[PDB]
Design a protein around this ligand. Structure first.
Ligand SMILES: O=C1CO[C@@H]2CCN(C(=O)N3CCC(Cc4ccc(C(F)(F)F)cc4)CC3)C[C@H]2N1
Ligand code: NA
Ligand code: NA
Length: 295
């Protein structure tokens, strides 16, 4: 008699049968998270995390959103957190978009007739933009926290040179240096928390992944005249990872009739984990913006 093979486990050795999950189009398990209110939800909202991190870092934001009667849902992108895949590797950037759409489609089957919002930070913001641009008119709104629209000019040069070296030769292990944690936030405790989380990948960015981030930036630029979804864009003026010029470009080139930008003077990249004055404002602004569009 044939027997079933050992249960599929996360990269941290936890069986997926003991966790909320989804199998993507490539047969890879994605770890999922849900924060549902006690009553009938007013709307659904997918949270899209950034490069190297994972969905567990959105606990406080998600609880605030759930407190507004929204059903919040997320998954760790392939190659991240508790999902399967080689760490920080993606065959094509569109895999992330495809997987967000599968999860949104699955949730809309269980909760039909509800409006659906997107919330994305950094690389997750580029994913949210590309997701909304692929389905014009489908999403009720998008909340972008320091989205990857334009990379820091020095880093864009570094990866364009590295991409040209691997495009011309075979160098599978080539990587840049790691993301300097000190530029993430002026809140030193949040920098320390980022440096202590075992689910965060703090290795140098592989050049193949850098190529997909260059693809994301190029695709976001081409998508902006197709973008009509309502959005709230939050950006720090001293962001060394996602250049603030990208936020101004998004405000200018998107076709959206409902677009708002809030600049946080002197703030770094991770606005929802910045100094308390900034973080409290970020939570308040997202609460007001989503409340106004779910009433
Ligand atoms: O809470 C956190 C923890 O710290 C995280 C660092 C990486 N973040 C990102 O998603 N990125 C995206 C990639 C950026 C670096 C980069 C590299 C290459 C390119 C390009 F030139 F190749 F396109 C673009 C940006 C840094 C910010 C998300 C951040 N959020
Ligand atoms: Na399949
Ligand atoms: Na419903």
């Amino acid at each position: 008699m044939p027997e079933e093979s050992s249960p599929r486990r996360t990269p941290q050795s936890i069986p997926y049968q003991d966790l909320p999950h989804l199998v993507n189009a490539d047969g890879q398990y994605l770890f999922c998270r849900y924060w549902a209110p006690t009553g009938t939800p007013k709307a659904l909202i997918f949270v899209s995390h950034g490069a190297g991190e994972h969905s567990g870092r959105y606990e406080e934001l998600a609880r605030m959103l759930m407190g507004l009667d929204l059903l919040v849902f997320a998954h760790d992108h392939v190659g991240h957190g508790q999902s399967e895949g080689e760490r920080m590797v993606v065959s094509d950037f569109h895999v992330f978009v495809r997987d967000v759409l599968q999860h949104v489609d699955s949730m809309q089957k269980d909760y039909p007739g509800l409006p659906v919002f997107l919330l994305g930070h950094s690389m997750g913001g580029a994913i949210a933009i590309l997701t909304a641009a692929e389905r014009p008119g489908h999403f009720a709104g998008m909340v972008l926290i320091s989205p990857l629209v334009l990379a820091n000019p020095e880093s864009a040069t570094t990866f364009k040179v590295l991409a040209a070296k691997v495009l011309n030769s075979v160098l599978p292990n080539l990587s840049s240096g790691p993301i300097d944690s000190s530029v993430l936030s002026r809140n030193k405790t949040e920098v320390d928390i980022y440096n202590s989380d075992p689910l965060i990948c703090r290795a140098g960015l592989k050049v193949c992944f850098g190529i997909q981030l260059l693809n994301a930036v190029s695709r976001v630029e081409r998508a902006l005249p197709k973008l009509t979804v309502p959005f709230l864009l939050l950006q720090g003026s001293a962001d060394r990872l996602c250049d603030s010029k990208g936020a101004y470009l998004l405000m200018e080139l998107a076709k959206s009739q409902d677009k708002t930008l809030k600049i946080y003077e002197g703030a770094y990249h991770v606005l929802h984990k910045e100094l308390p004055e900034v973080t409290n404002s970020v939570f308040h602004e997202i609460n007001m913006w989503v409340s106004q569009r779910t009433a």
